[PDB]
Symmetry: C3
Subunit: 106 residues, 3 copies
């Protein structure tokens, strides 16, 4: 999946989490977010297509998904202990990061 | 260590987990798997020895080990809760990922 | 906010941890450490400034930060379970990883 599609997957599951009822839904959405973030590390945003795959710009891009992955880990750790409200609060901070990465590279 | 020896370490510890009797044994095996996966991320597998370390194929290889590392982390989270049987079930998914990586890159 | 400043942030929060009492203090210091390690992972350290960003040296540098990130995660897990003394013992060993990486690449 290209970068834009993976970002769409991230946002779709953020909405799933924000409207969620129980821990299971939150966990399944966070698991899909992790998979999308990892897949996006293999992608190239259109504006960086001319750059080296290991250029500092592309390193920045991939490590931005590492930042997201660690925030996803925190929310999923909260969700697996049944802390659904804390997991949703943390997902709200996930949306800020996702939006910032979207704005930076699109 | 080389990629192939890291892959042996992953397979060996998967067997350890399959037979494990308590949470400390599962945690220990998964910790060794994490070390081997991180070490393998610095390696070049046999299929990609004709590729540059910063080629897209090698970036994708390294992301594949990131994927493995996050699956290891899930099993380790179950084991840290003393849920031995759940963690062994999770390591079933690790086996699929490891075997797929073996077939793709050997 | 370059590599050297991140390594300083890592040492500062390590001192915060080694002189802490409750588990939330340790958690906050480890969370800032995680952020500093991730920022550093996208830097080029002084010793490698004359190397191609595609160099294997730079790949090894970045994987070394992944090793540090999982060590931070293990200490964070000990702290999230209330074992403040164990979190401080683990961070004692993080001190070595952090300062070794510092001295290696400065
Ligand atoms: Ca070669
Ligand atoms: Cl890379
Ligand atoms: Ni965790």
């Amino acid at each position: 999946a290209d970068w834009e599609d993976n970002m769409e997957t991230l946002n779709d599951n953020l909405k799933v989490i924000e409207k969620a009822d129980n821990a299971a839904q939150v966990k399944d959405a966070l698991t899909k977010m992790r998979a999308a973030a990892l897949d996006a590390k293999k992608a190239t945003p259109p504006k960086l297509e001319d750059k080296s795959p290991a250029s500092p710009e592309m390193i920045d891009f991939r490590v931005g998904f590492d930042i997201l992955l660690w925030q996803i880990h925190d929310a999923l750790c909260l969700a697996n202990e049944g802390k659904v409200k804390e997991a949703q609060a943390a997902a709200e901070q996930l949306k800020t990061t996702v939006n910032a990465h979207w704005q930076k590279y699109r």
